[PDB]
Design a protein around this ligand. Sequence first.
Ligand SMILES: Fc1ccccc1C1=Cc2ccccc2C2=NCCN12
Lengths: 364, 29
Amino acid sequence: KCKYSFKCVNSLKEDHNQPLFGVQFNWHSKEGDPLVFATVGSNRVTLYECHSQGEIRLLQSYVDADADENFYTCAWTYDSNTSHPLLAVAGSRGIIRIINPITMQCIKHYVGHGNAINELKFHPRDPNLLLSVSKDHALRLWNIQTDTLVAIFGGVEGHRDEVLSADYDLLGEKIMSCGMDHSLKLWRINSKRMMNAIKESYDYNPNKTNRPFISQKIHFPDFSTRDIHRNYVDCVRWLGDLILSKSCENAIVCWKPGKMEDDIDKIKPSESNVTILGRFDYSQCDIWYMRFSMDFWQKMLALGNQVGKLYVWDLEVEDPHKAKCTTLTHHKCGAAIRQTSFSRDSSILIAVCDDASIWRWDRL
Amino acid sequence: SMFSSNRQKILERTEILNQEWKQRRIQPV
Ligand SMILES: Fc1ccccc1C1=Cc2ccccc2C2=NCCN12
């Protein structure tokens, strides 16, 4: 029942020969505009334009002052004032860098996270609210307009180990987080407490006060489970009101909090139930930090493995067996595929590998 | 069905996000 077909049009290696962990297409650019994506790995942040006939044009290369730094994630946004594109990067050093993609010059660096940062996500509605998951067991929500730490998610009922991923729902009402503690927790940010916290962070101004901004400390999630996976949870994304998550278990599980017919906004924080709806089976992805992704309209699901194969599913198919598309393979792609990014229109698919290579796959 | 109802939520919502994107001009890099 899957329709989708791709073509490997191009591949290149970055001369640093260090693993590429993250890849992201800038989905903020408008129609007709160039299709730009960023790659992160080592102390490097490289930008690329996608052109006709599988041409991948190198634009700029940010090389971090810190040689020890190893970037793991990157998130695209824009300046709410100027409409100027903005890119946020983070890694091992646990420092969030806000880069001007046009000058490839850092504009601000947020510190606070006690350890490494594994994920970065911009709220789907507000371009200033940056979420970061950390090795320090907590989630930090930041206002990048007023340079404030809005909230710290964690504590008494937060993750008991390194948080590995997180995802906002389409509307930006809530976050689903996951980590080495095998759990998946839900944080509602549309609570009278959170919305007020966000509002307060916008009214905060240093040239009006001597006293610093007080972050909210959210010790209690609105849902928790360890009934989904038997090892670390390395990737989590929402599929509407449903969750898609994975472990080393060679499957992406589609589940939901509570009993099969319980509405997500009606489940109580003390809910013990969970409903496993389906599995996306694949192979040779028994290692950690392998991140699956989707296209804007959430019709496609891509995942890479340790041997350079690229699994794709058609999410519009109900049974996840018949949803399977042709595994994208290339006898020259044998390194582990850390992450993939579709272009906003789905015409391009990029994969990043451990051997410092980028692989381009154009839809037919 | 469960699936059909969830796919519609995806449509309605992603359209809200798309309509927000269309009403916006972001500078090329
Ligand atoms: F650094 C590495 C060296 C070799 C293999 C993997 C990694 C790595 C990749 C990564 C990617 C996304 C998020 C977090 C991570 C991460 N956190 C610690 C280790 N690590």
